[PDB]
Structures are given as structure tokens and as C-alpha cells.
Amino acid sequence: NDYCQHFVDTGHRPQNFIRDVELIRLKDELIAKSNTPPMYLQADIEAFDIRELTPKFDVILLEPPLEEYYREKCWTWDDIMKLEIDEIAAPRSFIFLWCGSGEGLDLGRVCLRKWGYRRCEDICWIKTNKNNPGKTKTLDPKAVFQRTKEHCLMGIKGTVDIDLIITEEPEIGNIEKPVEIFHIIEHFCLGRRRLHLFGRDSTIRPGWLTVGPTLTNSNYNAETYASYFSAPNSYLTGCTEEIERL
Amino acid sequence: RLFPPQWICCDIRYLDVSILGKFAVVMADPPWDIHMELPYGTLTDDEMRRLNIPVLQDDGFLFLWVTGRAMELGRECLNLWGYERVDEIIWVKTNQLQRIIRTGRTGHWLNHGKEHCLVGVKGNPQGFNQGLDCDVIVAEVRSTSHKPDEIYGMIERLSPGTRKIELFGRPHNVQPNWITLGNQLDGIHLLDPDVVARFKQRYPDGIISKP
Numbered sequence: 001n002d003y004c005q006h007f008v009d010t011g012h013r014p015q016n017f018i019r020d021v022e023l024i025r026l027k028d029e030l031i032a033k034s035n036t037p038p039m040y041l042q043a044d045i046e047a048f049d050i051r052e053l054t055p056k057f058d059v060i061l062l063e064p065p066l067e068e069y070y071r072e073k074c075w076t077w078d079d080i081m082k083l084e085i086d087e088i089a090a091p092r093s094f095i096f097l098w099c100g101s102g103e104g105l106d107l108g109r110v111c112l113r114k115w116g117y118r119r120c121e122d123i124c125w126i127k128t129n130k131n132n133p134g135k136t137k138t139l140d141p142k143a144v145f146q147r148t149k150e151h152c153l154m155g156i157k158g159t160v161d162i163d164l165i166i167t168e169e170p171e172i173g174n175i176e177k178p179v180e181i182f183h184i185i186e187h188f189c190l191g192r193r194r195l196h197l198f199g200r201d202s203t204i205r206p207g208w209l210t211v212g213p214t215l216t217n218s219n220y221n222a223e224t225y226a227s228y229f230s231a232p233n234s235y236l237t238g239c240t241e242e243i244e245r246l
Numbered sequence: 247r248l249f250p251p252q253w254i255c256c257d258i259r260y261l262d263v264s265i266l267g268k269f270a271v272v273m274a275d276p277p278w279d280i281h282m283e284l285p286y287g288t289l290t291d292d293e294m295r296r297l298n299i300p301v302l303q304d305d306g307f308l309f310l311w312v313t314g315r316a317m318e319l320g321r322e323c324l325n326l327w328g329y330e331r332v333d334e335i336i337w338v339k340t341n342q343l344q345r346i347i348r349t350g351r352t353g354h355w356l357n358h359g360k361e362h363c364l365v366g367v368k369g370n371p372q373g374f375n376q377g378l379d380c381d382v383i384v385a386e387v388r389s390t391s392h393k394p395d396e397i398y399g400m401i402e403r404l405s406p407g408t409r410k411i412e413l414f415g416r417p418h419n420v421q422p423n424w425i426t427l428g429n430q431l432d433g434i435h436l437l438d439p440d441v442v443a444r445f446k447q448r449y450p451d452g453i454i455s456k457p
């Protein structure tokens with residue numbers, strides 16, 4: 001009955017017991033047909049001037065490498081808050097910020113507001129430990145509870161899915177977030193200009209521009225990129241038919 | 247200790263909570279002003295800010311349920327009242343077969359699978375059992391608008407035998423070691439002698455009026 005008690009008794013997290021961890025496919029197909037070719041750029045985001053990334057984005061996914069992701073160089077909230085995200089967001093646009101499980105849940109909201117967004121969803125990545133019951137970690141010293149989830153805050157500026165992702169906890173030092181976040185974002189049909197900051201070779205994806213320090217290669221060209229969104233395709237949502245040409 | 251259930255039927259805006267003493271844990275489930283017409287009475291942002299939460303504890307923990315824009319307002323209140331937020335519990339709402347209950351609300355982008363409870367700390371809490379529980383609750387949606395009973399067990403393992411206070415609690419919430427406040431409770435049931443004395447002298451005619 002009481003899965004909290006059960007966790008205390010056995011080390012199996014309550015979420016281990018959630019079961020089941022249309023033409024939603026037709027729509028996945030339209031996303032795939034709409035998607036720009038994958039574009040990517042190796043850039044030191046601290047040293048690099050963000051305004052070089054054009055045009056202005058419909059969606060920004062921001063995944064700064066927090067020290068908390070590495071238990072057994074990282075960005076602090078000081079560093080993140082000083083990013084010039086409002087300089088590259090479209091007047092109507094969305095952001096998804098991975099905030100971790102600690103002070104990020106507060107500081108990430110200050111960030112969103114600083115950049116001109118309002119927080120409109122809180123997506124939790126709940127991590128199961130089905131293959132590794134018990135086997136716990138050193139609490140951040142302010143922690144009261146074992147932290148078994150991560151939050152991705154969604155923000156909107158200007159004017160299908162559930163807010164949970166459940167997967168098994170990744171092996172130690174594996175920093176990746178669930179690819180399901182992309183499925184959630186793309187299903188909102190928000191526009192085709194999609195930026196992933198602090199992406200990696202492993203996250204590069206059709207329909208996205210990926211920018212990050214560890215990229216081994218680049219293909220980014222601002223003019224070529226801008227040409228994917230020129231008329232008559234300026235206002236596509238990314239969930240509708242390509243416009244016929246000759 | 248295991249002090250039996252106590253409660254006070256009141257308007258929480260008007261009760262002088264200084265008569266209750268100090269608690270290791272405060273929990274609140276406020277009827278936040280979620281900018282919307284609702285069938286129940288809400289508290290304005292100002293009334294929430296003005297609640298005299300700071301008198302209820304010197305050292306300990308606050309559990310504050312939040313939803314919608316109260317995710318932000320609740321953080322403001324928490325800070326305003328002298329707490330730092332150090333954890334966030336989510337309750338994943340299921341049915342009797344452990345399937346997520348998924349409700350959608352207009353003006354929202356996503357279906358919601360969970361409720362959030364902020365955890366704040368004030369002062370120098372000592373002798374708490376940190377890290378026994380984890381920060382996800384998976385439990386059955388019973389009555390509409392109720393919280394899961396699991397939270398009480400988590401709090402008791404965290405802080406066994408200490409005095410606790412719940413604000414905006416329902417009758418089914420009353421419990422040993424807790425004093426429960428809310429306006430749907432049935433009169434007043436107080437057993438702690440210290441509280442009984444202070445209440446008699448503050449409220450000799452038993453009446454808890456707009457001050």
C-alpha cells in the first residue's frame with residue numbers, strides 16, 4: 001500500500017511501481033518531414049558571442065553542465081544567469097531549462113524571468129532504480145530527502161503529453177537527459193527554429209541546431225540556416241505539410 | 247511522544263497562532279488564489295504573505311503544497327516567512343492499478359501527472375533523520391482535492407515524536423502529534439496543558455473573531 005514505507009524497507013523507489021512507464025504517429029511523420037537538416041556548431045559558450053546565432057529561435061533547450069550532475073568545467077548558476085538568452089529568443093518563443101534537483105529549481109526560475117519568460121510548466125524526470133535498489137548517494141548537505149528526479153522548466157514569452165518522464169537512473173557519470181524531452185518539445189508544434197545549448201555529438205538531431213563546447217565537428221552556416229526558414233516557410237509550426245514548390 | 251489529535255476550527259487569517267507554541271514541522275495546503283473562479287474561498291496573495299508562519303517555529307521544516315502560479319508565490323512566501331527551500335516533493339497521482347491519473351486544464355501546454363510540495367528549512371534543525379525517504383510519492387487519488395496520507399509517514403520518520411502543526415487541514419487529517427487548523431473542523435479539541443492555558447487566557451469566551 002504505502003510505497004514510501006516500502007522504499008524505507010527495501011530501497012525500491014516508489015516510482016519503480018508505476019505501471020506503463022492514435023495518429024500521434026501521423027504527426028510524428030509530419031514533424032519528420034518538416035524538420036530542417038541537423039545543424040551543429042562547436043563553440044565555447046562562455047567565450048562565444050551568442051548573437052552570432054541567428055535567426056531568432058522559436059525554442060531554446062538549455063542544458064548547462066551543473067556540478068551536481070558529476071558526483072563520483074561545470075557551469076554555476078552565476079555563469080548561467082549571465083547568458084544573454086533574451087538576445088537570441090524570438091519575441092514569441094519558448095525555453096526548456098534543465099535545472100537539476102537543488103538550488104536550480106529556484107535559480108532557474110530567476111533565470112527564466114530575467115530573460116523575459118514566465119514559467120508555464122514544470123517537467124519532472126523521475127528516475128527508477130529497478131536494477132539497483134538501495135545503493136544511495138551522499139545527500140547535498142541541505143537535502144532532507146533522497147533526490148530521485150530532475151526538473152526541466154518550460155517558459156514562454158510573448159502571447160498530448162504529460163509533465164513526467166520516467167526512466168531508469170543512468171550509470172554514474174552519465175550526464176545525458178532522456179531523449180523524450182525532444183518528443184515533448186516537438187509535439188507542442190511551436191516553430192521550426194530550435195536551438196539546443198550545451199548539446200553534444202550524442203544529442204544532435206534533425207530539426208535542431210546544436211551548440212556546445214564538446215562537439216567534434218561543425219556544419220553551421222548562419223545564411224544557410226536562415227534559408228531553411230525563408231518565405232514561404234517563415235511561420236510553419238513544424239507539424240504541417242511542406243509547402244509545394246516547383 | 248505520542249500526543250493524541252488536537253484541532254481548532256477557525257479562520258486561519260484571524261487566529262492568534264502565538265498561543266500554540268513552537269513546532270518541529272509546519273505543513274500547509276493553502277487555497278491559493280489561482281487567478282480563476284473557484285467553488286471554494288481563496289486567500290489573496292497579501293493574506294498569504296501576512297500569515298503569521300514565522301511565530302510557529304524556531305528550528306525546523308515547512309511543507310508547502312503549491313500548484314500553478316503558487317509555484318512562484320509559494321517560493322516568495324516561503325522566503326518572506328524566513329525559510330530556505332531545500333527540497334521539493336512530487337506526488338505522482340495514480341489509480342488503484344498504479345496508472346498515472348492525467349488531467350488537462352485549459353491554458354496549459356501539458357497534462358499534469360503530479361502535485362508539488364515545497365520543503366523549507368528555518369534555523370538549526372538538529373536530530374532529524376534526513377534521507378530516509380525519497381522525494382517522489384506514488385499514491386492513489388482518493389477524494390478530490392485531498393493530499394496523500396503518505397506525507398504524514400514521511401514527516402514522522404523525518405521527525406519522530408515532535409509536535410507538528412497543519413494549516414488548512416480537513417477532519418480526516420487529524421493525527422497524533424499534530425494540531426490541525428482549518429474552517430471545516432468541528433469546534434475545538436485541545437489537550438496540551440500549555441496550549442489549553444494560553445488559549446483560555448487569549449480567548450476566555452472561546453470566540454475567535456476578526457481581531
Ligand SMILES: COc1cncc(-c2cn([C@H](C)n3ccc(N4CCC[C@@H](NCC5CCC5)C4)cc3=O)nn2)c1
Nearest residue numbers: 257258275276277286287288311361391393414428429
Ligand atoms: C479562504 O479562507 C480560509 C481561511 N481559513 C481557513 C480556510 C480553510 C480551507 N480549508 C479547506 C480544507 N481547504 C483546504 C485546502 C484547499 N485548497 C484548494 C483546493 C486544493 C487544495 N490543494 C490540494 C493539493 C494538495 C495536494 C493536492 C488546497 C481548499 C479548501 O477549502 N480548511 N480551512 C480558508
